[PDB]
Structures are given as C-alpha cells and as structure tokens.
Symmetry: C5
Subunit: 395 residues, 5 copies
C-alpha cells in the first residue's frame, strides 16, 4: 500500500498483542534466553562490608513466536526497533545483589522477522561476595554473579550462553586497567538450583577472578619501619651513661606505637582474617621490647649507687674473653693522725672512683657485645624478609 | 478453538476483572494469606542508631475466587504467570521499618486453576531493634520483625505460616556464615494486636536471634594492654635514683591514656550500656595510679635534700626483717686549729655521705619490696582474668 | 442480583466518579478533616544542623458526599476498601519539613456507607526545629510539627482532632524507651495562620517535648578530669628540687589540652549556645595555670645560682609562723698564710652550702604551705560541684 | 440543572481540553508569568564545594484563555481547584542548580473565572554560588538564583513580579533567625539573557545577601592562643640555668603546632582565599621562633664549657648601663713547694668559679632585658589587635 | 476555521501518530542527530575513585518526517512546542557514566514546519576517567565523554556536530572560573566503534582538558617544612655538652613524622602514582637522619667516661688546620710521703680535667665544622629547589 512500511509493519505486529503472556504457541515448550556479560571496571571493593561494586555491559536474546512476518512484504524489512514496554520481557536477576541497581532505562529493542528479540543494557551491580585477606597485599579474589529467573522454573525458562565459554573468559577488551584492582578472568558455568525438593531453577554463575596491585601499600608499610630501625641503630650508637638513652628509646617506641595504632584501623577490617603483616609487626614489636630491656639492663649495671667492687668470679674471664677472642678491639703524733684523717678520706674516695671505673668498663663491654648481637639479628631478619619477597616475586 | 491456549485463557481470566476489590464471593469470609521468610545475610548492625539492615527472601500465597477455570479446557493448563499489577495484592508490611526498602519489583505471579496465587520477592529490610551491649564481645541479640496488614483488620486478613514452625527455625540453608555476625535461630509466633478497644489486627512476629564472633575484638583489645604491662615491668626494673623513672612512667601513662581515648569512641555507643571492658580498663587505670604513686614515694624517699639521718625506731627492725625473713637476698696551737678546721669540714662531709648511704639503701630495699608486691598482684589479676575467660569458653 | 455484592457495590460507587473535584454538594460548605498522630521513636537529633528525624503513625478521616449507598442493598455491607488513587485526597503537609519523607504508599482506604473515609499511613519526618544546649546534659527540647493544607484556605478545609487533646498528650503506648532521648509529651493546638491580609489557613500544631538521658555523657566527661586531678596531686607530692616537676606538669597539661581539644568538636556545635561545661573546663584550666605558676615560682626560689643569703626581714617571722602557728609539723709565717688560703676557701664553700641549706628549707616550707592551700581549694570546689549535682538531682 | 455545580463546571472546563498546547488564542501574544519567593531557612553553606542549600516557598500565577466561564452559571462559583497534571504548566527552572530538588508534589491549583491560574509549592534548592572567605569570621555573601524558562524564548514567556520589589527585599517574615547564618536581603532584578545572537530569554535574578554570626568561632580561635601566651610568660619567668627551659619551649611549640595543624583543615577550604587569621597565626608563629631563639642564645651564653673570662670591652659598660639607667633594679723548701701545689690548684679552681659567677650574672641580666622587651612587644601587639577588633565592632 | 490555530495544528499533527516507530519514510535512510555541549562547572574530581562530576548544558536536533505542515495554513505558524513524551526520541547516552544522572525532566521540545525537532536539557554527569598525579600540584588532566546510541547501529543513527569544531573548543562563556580546577579546552572528535566484526556504531568523543590551580597546596606543603628547618638551625646553634640536644632533635623528628603521616593520607591516593613531593619528603627525611647522626656522634665524642687523652696523630694536624686554614675564627719522711699522697691525688685529678678540656675543645671544633657543612648543603638544596620552581614558572 501507499502507507510507509515501518508504520504498517508496527501496526500489524502490535495489533491485539498481549504483553502479559509468555509468547509460546505450546505451553509445554520452555523459552530459551541466551545472555552474555562484558566487564567495564571494578568500581569498589569494600572489605568491612564485603561489598563489590562493578559495571557491566549485559546483552541477551530470546525468541518471540508472535512477532513474525514475511520479509517480502512491508518493503524488505528484516528487522526493526520496538519499545521495550510493549512486549513481554523475562525477569532475569542476580541472587547476590544487596543494593538496587541505579541503571538507566533502555526503551528500545531489536525485533527480527524470525522472532529474534535482543536487548542491550548497562548494569551497575552492588553485590556481596566473600573476601579473604589472609595475604592482604597479594590477594586473589573470586566473586560469584548468579543470573537466574526469580519466579519462573526450569520448565519455563533456562539460560544459555550467547558465545562459547572459551572466548568469554578471555575477552578483556574494554576493561580499565588503571585502578587498584586488575581483572584476571571471568569463568561461566551453568547449574540447576533447588532449595526444595519441589521446584527447580536454571542459573548461570559467573566467577570473576581479580587480583590486587601491591606496589603502593607494600612500600607505604615497609618504609617507616626500616626508617626507625635505622634511627634505633643510631640510638644504640649512643653512650649508655649519658642518661638520655631511655628517653630516646621510649620516645621511639611511642612514635611507632601511635603510628601502628592509627594505621591498623584503615586496612585491616575482616574479623576472621589474620594477615602476616600483623606477624611482621609483632616480631618488630618484640625486637623493640628486647632492645628496651637491654638498654634498661645496661643502664642499671652502669649507674652509680655507691655499689661495691666487681665480684671477681665473672671478672677474671669476662675482660679476658672480650679481647682477642670475640671482640678483637707531743705535736708530731697529733699532726700525723690529723693528716692521716684526710689521707684516709681521699683514699676511700679514690677507691670509690676506681670501683666506678671498673663497673663502667664492664658496662661498656657488655653494651658493645649486645649491640653486635642485635645488629647480627637484625641483618639476619632483613635477609630472611628480602629473600621471602624475592621468592614470591620470582614465583 | 484455533487460538493459542495461553492467550485465550488470559483473555477469559482478565476480562471484566476489577483489581480494586477483595476477591471474595462472601464479604463475611476473611482472606487468608500464608507467608514465609528465609534469611540471606546480616548486612549491618548499627549500635549508635540501633538499626538492623538485613536481606531476606519472602514468599506468600493466598486464594483468589475470581481466577478459577476448568483444567480440561485451554489445552490442559494447570497454572500460568500473570502480571502483578493486574490483580489484587494485599498490603503486608513490617511495623519496625525505619527506611523504605530499596527492593526491585517482581512483575509476575503464579496463578493456579484452584485460585491459588503465589508471590516471591526479595526484601532489604532496614528496621530498628533494641541492642544490649552489657557483654559487648559476647552479646546475643534478638530482633523482631512483625508482618501485618497496615489497614485491613482481622475480620478481613489474618496471616498464617506456609511451613511448620519447627522446620522454619532451623533452615539456615543459604545464610552467609562469613562476616561479623552469626545467625542462631528465627522463631515465628502469631499474635493479635490492638491499641484501641475498637479494631483488632493479626500479626506474625519473627524473632531473629543472632550471635557475634568475638575472635578479633578480644585480642585487638587485650594485646596492647598486656604489652605495656610488660613495658611497665621493665620500667620497674630500673633504678630509682636515676631520675628518668618518673618521665618514663608519665610517658607510658600518656600513651595508654591517648590509646584508650581514641579507642573508646569506636565500639562504645550505647548510653545505657556499661560493658565490663570499662571495668577492666578502670582496674588497669587504678593499677597504673598505684604504680605512679609508689614511684613518686620512692623517688621522694631516695632524693637528697640535705636530710637528716634515718630515725632509729623503724631502722632497727626494717633492715633486719628484709634479710632472711621475707627477702632472702705559739705556732703549734695555730697549726693544730688550722688543720682541725679542714678535719671538721671533711668529717661533716663524710657524715652527710654516710647519711645518704643509709637513706639510699633504705629506699632500695623498699623499692624491691614494693616491686615484689606489685608483681604478685599483677600475676594474681592475670590468673583471675584468664580463668574467667576459660570458664566462659568451657561453658 | 446474582452478581457478587462487593463487585457491584464498587461498580455502582466508582461509576462516573471524578477524583479531581472536591466532594461537596454545596461549594459554600468546607470539608472537615480530623487527624491524629502517634509517636513511634526518635530516630535522630542533629544539633549542628538542627534536624529532627522521627517516625509517626498518622491517621485521618473526612466525609465524602458522593460515596453513599443504602446498607439494605449489596448484601448488608456497611464498609469496604477502595484504592486511594481512585478518590479525592486532601493535600495535608507539614510546614517544617526539610527532606522529602521516604514513606511507603498505602494503596487502600476504608469507605463507609455514610461517606466516612479513613486513611492510615506511617510517616518518617525529617523536620527542622530550634535546639538549645545551654544546659546540654540536662536539656529539655520542644519541637513543632504544623499540619496544614498547602493550597486550600480555611474556607475549604479546616483540621480537627480525632480524639480529645487530654488523652492525646498522654498516650505513650508504642514509644521506644530505649535510646538516647525520652519522650515527655505531645501537646496539640489549633491556630489560624495568615502571612497576608488576603488569605487565611487552618493549622494543627503539635508541640513534642522530649528529654535527654544524661547518664553516659556526664560520667564520660567527669571521669578523666578528676582522674588527672589525682595524678596532679601525686605530682605535687614530689620534691621541688628534683628538676622533673616542671616536665611532669607540662606533660599533664599537654595531655589534658589535647584531650579537651579532641573532645570539644564532637558534642558542642551550636554557635549561640554556651554550656556551663565550658565554664567547668575554664575553671579547671585556670586551676592548672595556678598550679604551674606555683611550681615555677617554687623551682625558681629553690634553684641555686650562687645567690646570697636569705634576707632577714621575712626570715625572722617566716620560719617562726610556720611552726606551732599554722603548720603544726721565716717558715712559720709562710706556712700559716699558705694553710690560711685553704682555710678561707673551705670557709667560703661552707658558707655557700649553708646559704643553700637555708634557701632550700624556705622553699620546702613555702611548697608545703601552697600545697595545703591548693588541696583545700580543690576540696572546696569538689564539694560545691557535688552539692550542685545533688541539688539538681533532688529537684 | 440538578447536577452538582462543582461537578458540571469541571466537566465543562475539562471537556476536549489539550494540556500540551500553550493556552493562547493568538500565537503572537506571549504568556506572562508572575512569580515570587519567600525564604524559610539557610540549610547549609559548604565552602569546599561552594554549595548553598536553602528552603523557599515559591508561588506563581499566569492566565489561561481556555479556562473561562460565566460566574452567573454553575451556582455562583468564582474559583475552584483543578489537578495540576490536567492543565498546561510552564517549565520555570533555576540555572544555578547542581542537585535535583527533593520537593513534594502539589496536585492542585487554583483556577478563577477570568483565566487566572495560581500555583504554590515549596522548593529545596541546592545551588552553586561563589563564596569568598577573605574575612572568614565577618564575611557577607551574595548568591544568585536565576528563574527562567529552560526552553521557551522571550517571544513566548517572560517573567514578572507578583509584588513590588520594594516590599520583596524586606519581608523576613518566616525566616529562622536561629542558626549559623543571618539573612540580610533578597534583591530582585529582571534581565534578558542570550548566549547566541540567535535566541533571547527572560530571566529573574534574585540576589540573596546573608551574613555570618562570628560569636563562636572568634572566641574558639582566640582563647587557646592567648592561653598558651600566658603559659609562655610563666615559662620565661623560669631561671635560664635550670636546663629544662628548652624542653618546656619545644613542648609548648609542639602543642601549638599540632593544635594549628588539626584546626587548619576544618575551616579553611578555599584555594584562592587567604584569611587574615593565617596572618595572625604566622605572626604568633614568628613570635614563638624569636622566643625560642632568645632562650637558646641565653642558654648558650650561660652554660659552662670551661670558657674564659668575660671580655672587658662590653663588660665595662654592660653592667653599668643596666643599673639606674634602664633597669632600675732541706725539708722547709720541699714542704713549701708541696703546699704551694695544692694552693695553686685551689686558686685556679676559685678563678674558674669566679669566671662562672661573672658569666652567669651577665646571662641573668641579658635574660631580664630580653624578657622586658618581649613583654612590651606582646602588650603592644595585644593592644593593636584589641583596638582593631574595637574599630570593627563600632563600625 | 474558527478554531484556534495552535489547537488545530496540534490536533492535525498528533492525530494517528505512533511514537514507537523511527520517523523515516524509507527505512534505508539513517536518521542524523546533531548535538553540542557547553560546560558549566567542574563539580568534583575524586582521585581515589577516579570519578569526575561535572555539569553541562546539552542540546540536540534531528529531522522528523511525520511532523510537517504547510505554513500558509493554521495562521502562519512556523514552529511550536510539543510534549516530549508524545514523539519519538533517540536514546543517546555516554559510555563512561558510573552513576545515573539526577537531572530534571524537560517536558517540551520545539517542532518546526520542516520537520526540525530540537531538544535542550541540562546534564549532571558522574563519569570515570583516568587521573595521573605524577606531578600532583601541576597536573593537566584529559577526560573523555563519548556520546553514542546505546542500541541503534550506524545504519540507523550517526551523530554530527551542531557547530564547527573550531568554535566549540574555545567557547568558555559560562564556565565558573572560581574553584579548584580551571578549564582549558573541549576538543570534539567523531569515531566509528565496533567490538565485534558484526555491528558498527557512531560515537562523538569530547576530550575535556582541564588544569589545577596550585596556589594553595604548594605553600601549605612548603611552609611547615622550611619552618622546622629554621627551628633545626637554632637547635644546631645549641651547645653539644648541654645534654638536651638529643631530646630536641628527637622531638622535632617526632613532630615532623606525625605531621607527614597525618598529611600523606589526604592528597595521595593513586596506587600507581608517585609524585616528586614524596621525593622531596624523602630527601628532607634523609637530611634529618644525617643531622641526628651528626648530633649523636658529637655527643659521644664530647661525653666524659673517664676516657684517655686525645691520640696525637690526628691532634697534631686537626687543631692546626681549623685555624687560619678553613675556619678563620723520723717525722719528716712520713710528713713528706703523707702530703705527697694528696699531691698525687690532685695531680691525677688535674690530668683528668685537662684531658676533658682537650676532648671538649676537639668536639666543639668538629661541631662547628659539621654545622658549617650542613648549612652550606641546606643553602645549596634550597637554591636548587627555588630555581626549579622558577624554571617551571617562567616556562
Ligand atoms: C535448558 O538448558 C540446559 C543447558 O543449557 C539444559 O540442560 C536443559 O535441559 C534446558 N531445559 C530444558 C527444559 O530442556
Ligand atoms: C486467622 O488465623 C488465626 C490463626 O492463624 C486464627 O486464630 C483466626 O481465627 C483466623 N481468623 C479468623 C477470622 O478466623
Ligand atoms: C474549622 O474548625 C475550627 C476549629 O477546629 C473552627 O473554628 C472553624 O470555624 C472551622 N471552619 C469553618 C469554616 O467553620
Ligand atoms: C516581558 O516583560 C518585560 C519586563 O518584565 C518586558 O520588558 C518585555 O517586553 C515583556 N515581553 C514582551 C514580549 O513584551
Ligand atoms: C554519519 O556521519 C558520518 C560523519 O559524521 C559519516 O561518515 C557517515 O557516513 C554517516 N552515516 C551514513 C550512514 O552515511
């Protein structure tokens, strides 16, 4: 006729059409829907709430048996666009959502002459998947997205795949590499789900496996620790009898304590998780306690409290074994008694000074030996940590 | 006829159908709705606002007397799917909500040939239930969800249970165990509610009882306290006459004060609640005050202010009772007077030195005794705390 | 007829019915709406924004002159349920709202045979009312909720009360007592409001008077202050010539300064408000300044700078009035000159030592007197504060 | 007729009425809309985002040429209420909005017999206006709200004023005075806006001028500064040779540095703004640096390093000009040589003591002079600041 | 006819009009849409989320072949306004959005007699574009906005430009210059996009290039660093044997450490980014470590531990090369032996004092030399930094 073809085709197709009925001529034949998903970015990964926010492009197609026409008529039209609200649409959802998707509405769909109906839409998904932070900097996380019909059983709707699963898992075409997380793979799988023995449903589960870039957090956590390790080393270099060594040690301990306290609230959030970063912190913690205890012991040994002479049993071997063995390095009577009083006073003063000499020397030797032992221990621990990092990196 | 069965059945059912009228042939017969709920996860538990955010799967069914047909006709169809907006739907809500549920819309329901109508939907519930944190790490919380019709009375709508209450309370089939909270049970109950003496309503109350995992918070709260207890012990080991003991004690007190101040804002929020964690903090608080007072007293006794000799009454028993009892461990006259001047000066200097000797020894003995007493007290308190934790754990 | 009664009654009532017209046969007769409100909980009280978030159950009724029928017909039906969107509904709002209510939609209302139309709905109200925190822990707050028609004047719609105002103000049936705030009363009042001399409106103002529970904040604010008051007392007990007293005082002052700085941002928010808690803080502030000034003065008096002897005018009464009055407590010539040199040197050394004696004793006496005065002042201030708290509590 | 008048009038008016067409008989005549706005409260002023959140009551009117009727008919009805969605409504918006208004929908409007159509609605406006904080405590801010038609040009719609601009700017009838900001005026203006040379539009710009109450922030910023100024004064009162003066000064500097650091993030947010509060802080900053430098210089001059005698050139005038000028205030030979050894030793010791005497006295005099100079400088600065505050206050 | 023209024109145009069909007489001819965008403000730039929030004014036009009429009829009307929902509207979106735009709805569009249809609307865009902070204060950022049809291919819809691209990039007519960011340019480009080899699409990409104002952050980051550099200088001026130098250095180090820790969380957020501000911080970090090490070494050399005399090999050149070379600056026997005892004691005391003399002088000379070297190094570093800033500024 003289009417435009795209008008009369739509008039013929949409005439006496019911959108509330499943478009099958036989009710015993299920409606097959084929879907696929392409990842766009990882918006957010919240560990304290275990919430994954992501952006996907999702397209699906199915067959409508009431939307067929002869191509020879209506001016050779193979396909056209039809409003979404005027046709039947399956209710495909995800079981893992926790927030309603704030996605825009697409008001048009393709309709072909064979009954093929296709739908494209973006989806902002806020789902909940379990997150493990046992190795927090180097964690690899899998999350599940389960597409299924919320109401219809497997006797009415199953879900298939638009493309082969081999090429779906290795698309990575439009993913945003810049960010905190890096996508590894998206593995699809089909399953039959049934809580009851009564009804059965068909589900398509996508396992999204992603990895976290550790470049920033590793250095941001390791730099101040080794930095104050060096500061502690120059604190050891100090003399023990100055008296400010204890204040220096407690000031450094306060600084690192407040640093770790205000750091440990940000990254750690999982109740069941226990990262080895805490083990590293506890080891450093203990090394600082040993340092403080050694400093206190040396200060107590060096300090003067009118103490007695060094007891010989240790002394006859201690000074000997730290050189070339381990560390290579009438009026006259009254006048005489009167002057003897001052002589005795100065003699006992000199004896006290000599005792202080010997105790100070012993304390210095012990401080040197303990400093050497601590330095060797720190070097060994640093070597172990760096070789563990290397054996991770080489893989 | 030649028309498809699923089309003509829907046309016959939805013809001259009013969705604004209760579907009963007799107005004196109430409409019975049977509901059930399955828990999916505990999204959030806010104590400062007393807000519970949870995710449930809720399904209900009822009977429609205007949606019946003969199975022999319309090609043997026992049941079909009908749009939700084209039929009457009861207004079942929860009295405890504080935020509108951001749940998606399910546009289809099942309709059977006997008038059976079923509805499935997910619900994100943000309700308000009282929370008690008297024993915060080991708290067990019950919350109430009251499903009822907001307008219709018991003469029109009651609520029943789809399944037996015995199997409802022990489902736990799809609950997410990973998280902060662990679900214990969901007990259902039916009640008649009436504020006025005028109208009566039927309500279904679900008591959700859940438990909190204490593994993280307990250690995160107990570790720094005992850690600085050890640091305080090495502070006690110090000599009292060094002069830096008071600075060390006040620095440790400042550190633990700022730590507790910046910790006590996060977890404690309830105005009426008073956890025993505060009691533990106050006991440690007092133990630190006793420690500081003992240190100040020892410093005051040890310090030199040109004080007099130790008064004998205490001295004749104090030094004796701390060994093997408790702690086992002319020109000539002018010259003579001139030299006697220096002799007297040095004699009084030696007397001052001896007095300082004796006072220092007394202070050292007292410091040792108080250190022993403090150590025994700390060990006893630690034993009591650990045995209380054990008697909780064994239950 | 054979048609079901609930169907034909609705068909007769809703036939040729216009929902956009006020349902009055005479346009000169205003439509009377009777409303009432029941409080459920106090969700939030924000002082920095002066925002009150609350939850109410609100029900209203009016008369529709186009919804009447004979009870004898339609099978003895006195009342039924009708969709809300198919009938005229007045636009009753609150003038004080600042956020749109996120309340669910109730799609049904009661309709009686006399034209009685009733509506029930919950309302989450986010309004703005002035808050005064002059006595912040013990504040009693009134807020206003003004229900009125936004467009219709008093010639069309007034608002009445469903129940007597005597029983409305003392309902408190479903209020949640657990929380931060406690409800006292809800007083209703009717008023005529008119900005212009042109149009007049009818308004129903509910004054909600509530009270705040002070059990938590009072102790949480008073505990650390008195705690460090005790710590300051043990700091006073210290000797003045030790040299670490000034460091102790400034460390305590820094601790309380940082504590008050990080506390004063949370609770105080009102610009015009000035709580007496700030007055208490300022008084403690000044007492600490007096303490520091006394410590500095005593240290300056005690310290040795090769100063001269104590000037007699004060000394002849100062030491006397602090005991039993207030505080009860040739070769020979060369040799002689040579030895006289040492004699003079030791004599002047002894004179310096005696001067240091006397100045130290004077400083100790002054320190004791000032410590007694400070202790009496603190005890008096504590007595005044506790008796003020008691005279508030007894009321 | 016997039909109710309010029903038949609405039936006659709404019959064959098109709401999608501008209601003019001649297309060349523009439609005039008269609007006005009344301010209710200032909800929020965000400086870091430059966002103004406010609440207004907005009413407008226009003329509809298809809604006229004879008053003599339909029972003397001059005006009625009509649903908003059934009539044409102009699209008047604000160009400055950044967030969609969360305002409720008013479903009724007045219609008069002359075609007068009136509309009332509340509006929660979240707009963006430039904020200047050059004088942050005493800033007066103007913001612009531009009402205009988003699509229609000036050939179709202009905007006029309901009332005279003289009485609009001085309404202030329902404004909430309690809060942070105080409203000064609302000045209206009419303008023609055109980006292109093609189309022209009519706009109504309201300039809202408001003022900020400075009572809280001024005292909250000035109190701790002067407080620690007093504490610094008592620090100056200390002796210079005690050795704890440097620690006191650095502790006070650390306290004020951390205070200013944790304060400067809250109020200052504008990148281009530079308040004079920063100038005050920098001046105090420098005064503290001068204080620390003076303390270090005095400590260096006073300290003992076995230094030599005070060089006479300064000494002969320095001590003189600070009193009453500025500051008013054989065997015998062996024995003789042997004793001469001790005599020389004690003589050189006495010489060192005398040199220390003189250097200590010089340091004390210099410290007193610098303390006087610093006190005079602080008093002058305080006088200047208080007289600047007074000359602002008197205006 | 006597009917109003604007009514009958709309009746003729909207009669039997289908809004669900593409308005083309021939299905082989694509529909061309011409769009343009004008920037209004940069609302937000979030680096941790890489989110750009902006406000644009967007207008588009196309041709409708079913909306044509003869101008001679309907009273000379060239154009009119038509509701948006009654006509076909293309689905043009942006691929980069992450949040649904909260923009208001414009319910009217222009329709001309030639089929020209125009649409104007504001858009609040929340998109995701990569942000690089390698030079954070002086960063220039490009972001992409890709307008395309979400469903229709290039065989149905392409996108053109309303204006020439030369004048689009340099509009900057209504942009808000006040703020954090400054707009540089908006470059448009047309592209054909196709993931598959199957379908092709037309896209219009706008590259928005903007710049950040560095005036605030630069000074706010450089001021405290140089400030405490000056404080460190006055710390160097101190004597080394006082004993409080180490405490001063560690207090300053603690202050700058806590400052940098609480600053480094705000601005730095990108994982892959590494600003040179961190390099500046690390250089200052190292300079402070060198300062502390020098102070510790000088303190260790100066301190007295009853050490021996200065070993001559260094001493014979060290003191010489730092002046005018680099730094210009019977009874008798018993009595004799008795007195010889005191003579020997005082001789050895004098020898110890002389040794302490020499070691103190050597330490003072070394401290002066290291202070000079450190001052020269700091001056050189400051010169390098200021000349780098100058060579950036001149460009
Ligand atoms: C739906 O598809 C699955 C595999 O994709 C298949 O196993 C199942 O049999 C299909 N459903 C029916 C009813 O055949
Ligand atoms: C509704 O059910 C309850 C128990 O589920 C029952 O007690 C009540 O009688 C029922 N309602 C009516 C009107 O019978
Ligand atoms: C509406 O009610 C008030 C009191 O509730 C009454 O004073 C007023 O007269 C009533 N309105 C009319 C038009 O009578
Ligand atoms: C609209 O009003 C303005 C002043 O309010 C006037 O200048 C303008 O001419 C009016 N529009 C027309 C088309 O006359
Ligand atoms: C759409 O426009 C582009 C350039 O704007 C042009 O290259 C393309 O050919 C056009 N589409 C068709 C179908 O011609």
């Amino acid at each position: 006729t003289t009417q435009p073809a795209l008008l009369r085709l739509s008039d013929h197709l949409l005439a006496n059409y019911k959108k509330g009925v499943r478009p099958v001529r036989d009710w015993r034949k299920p409606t097959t829907v084929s879907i696929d998903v392409i990842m766009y970015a990882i918006l957010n990964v919240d560990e304290k709430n275990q919430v994954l926010t992501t952006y996907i492009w999702y397209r699906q197609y199915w067959t409508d048996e009431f939307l067929q026409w002869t191509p020879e008529d209506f001016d050779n039209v193979t396909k056209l666009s039809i409003p979404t609200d005027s046709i039947w649409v399956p209710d495909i959802l995800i079981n893992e959502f926790v927030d309603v998707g704030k996605s825009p509405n697409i008001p048009y769909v393709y309709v072909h002459h064979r009954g093929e109906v296709q739908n494209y839409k973006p989806l902002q998904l806020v789902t909940a998947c379990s997150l493990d932070i046992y190795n927090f900097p180097f964690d690899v996380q899998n999350c599940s997205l389960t597409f299924t019909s919320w109401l219809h059983t497997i006797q009415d709707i199953n879900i298939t795949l638009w493309r082969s699963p081999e090429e779906v898992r290795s698309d990575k075409s439009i993913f945003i590499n810049q960010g905190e997380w890096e996508l590894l793979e998206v593995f699809p799988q089909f399953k039959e789900f049934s809580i009851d023995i009564s009804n059965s449903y068909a589900e398509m589960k996508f396992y999204v496996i992603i990895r976290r870039r550790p470049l920033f957090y590793a250095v941001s956590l390791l730099l101040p620790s080794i930095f104050l390790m060096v500061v502690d080393i120059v604190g050891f270099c100090l003399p023990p009898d100055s008296g400010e060594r204890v204040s220096f040690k407690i000031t450094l301990l306060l600084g690192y304590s407040v640093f770790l306290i205000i750091v440990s609230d940000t990254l750690p959030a999982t109740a069941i998780g226990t990262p080895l970063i805490g083990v590293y912190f506890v080891v450093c913690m203990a090394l600082l306690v040993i340092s403080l205890a050694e400093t206190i012991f040396i200060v107590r040994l060096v300090h003067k409290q009118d103490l007695q002479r060094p007891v010989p049993d240790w002394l006859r071997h201690l000074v000997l074994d730290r050189i070339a063995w381990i560390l290579c390095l009438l009026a006259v009577r009254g006048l005489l008694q009167e002057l003897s009083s001052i002589r005795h006073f100065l003699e006992k003063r000199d004896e006290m000074r000599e005792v202080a000499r010997d105790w100070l020397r012993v304390g210095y030797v012990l401080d040197r030996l303990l400093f050497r032992i601590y330095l060797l221990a720190v070097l060994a621990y640093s070597i172990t940590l760096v070789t563990l990092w290397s054996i991770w990196h080489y893989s």
